Structures are given as C-alpha cells and as structure tokens.
C-alpha cells in the first residue's frame, strides 16, 4: 500500500477511488485528507447516488451542512433512477442539514432550503403511503398495481 500511495499517476488514483467505492471501503476513502478526491466527486456527484452520498459525507464531517443539503435536495428532484424511499432519505437528510448553522451562509438561505426540503418530504411521505396501500389493497387488480408502482416509485409527483 506504500507503492500505491506513493504514486503520481492521476488516472490511476481516479481508478482507485472508483475501486474503493466498488469494494465498499468507505474505511479508506473517507480517510483521505486530499481535496483531489473531493474534486473528483464534485464532477460525478450529480451523476450517481452512491457518489453523491460520499460527497455529502465529506461535506458534513467538515461542518459544511448546507452544501450537503443542496446536493441531497437536487438529487431528490432529479430524473436519475432513484427510488421513492431513497428520495425520502435524501430529503430527510437535507432537512436536518439545512436546519443547523453553516458558516458563511445567511440564515435566509438556510431556511429557504430547509423549507423546500420539508415540503417535498411531506409530499413524498404521502406518495409512499399511497403506493404501499395501493399495492396491498385486495380490491385492486394486479394489472393496475404494476402500473401504479411504475408511476409512484420514482420522482415525487405533484399533489
């Protein structure tokens, strides 16, 4: 592992960040002082959920809660393939992270994000309560249930 960390090959270190992510070694990746890994995540954060989650962990441990709430909220409003329940977790985290002070950011900007995440989380829970009840309902034909699961187990719908 010395030979690994003693390298200056950049495509290599990118390939190793991806490999650590694959194997699940949050142990070793979260323990890198470097910003090089943060910058690498900032480009692909809004591309994949698993990468965004890593980026948000780096922000939170650095008391940058508002920036994580921003990543999580945009991810919940996006058209990436994300389940409704995963979008409930993202909003719930963003709601908490925007409710606490982050230095350098105005109280107004925090509250406006904490409010957008609170409303979207309220709608998401309604949608989750619906989807669950509809799937379990004995009086609903199977043919329709599959159709319900397609349109409700994804991005959050209007009221």
């Amino acid at each position: 592992y010395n030979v690994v960390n003693d390298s200056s090959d950049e495509v290599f270190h990118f390939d190793m960040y991806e490999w650590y992510i694959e194997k699940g070694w949050t142990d070793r990746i979260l323990s890198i002082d470097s910003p090089h890994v943060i910058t690498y995540l900032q480009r692909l954060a809004e591309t994949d959920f698993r990468h965004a989650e890593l980026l948000c962990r780096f922000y939170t441990t650095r008391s940058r809660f508002f920036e994580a709430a921003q990543v999580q909220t945009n991810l919940a409003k996006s058209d990436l393939n994300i389940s409704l329940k995963d979008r409930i977790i993202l909003l719930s985290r963003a709601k908490g992270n925007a409710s606490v002070n982050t230095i350098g950011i105005s109280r107004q900007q925090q509250q406006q994000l904490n409010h957008e995440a609170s409303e979207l989380l309220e709608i998401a829970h309604i949608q989750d309560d619906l989807l669950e009840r509809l799937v379990a309902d004995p009086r609903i034909p199977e043919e329709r249930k599959a159709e319900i699961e397609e349109f409700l187990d994804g991005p959050i719908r209007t009221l």
């Binding site: 609903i140 034909p141 043919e143 329709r144 159709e147 209007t158 009221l159």
Partner: peptide
C-alpha cells in the same frame, strides 16, 4: 399547487390498452 379535474382521468380499476 393543486388542481382537481374529475373530468378526464384514467380508470384506476381497468387495465391499460
């Protein structure tokens, strides 16, 4: 923003196509 429209929906109790 909510807008009720009972007019044209999709029969929740009938399959598609």
């Amino acid at each position: 923003k909510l807008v009720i429209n009972k007019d044209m929906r999709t029969d929740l109790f009938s399959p598609p196509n």
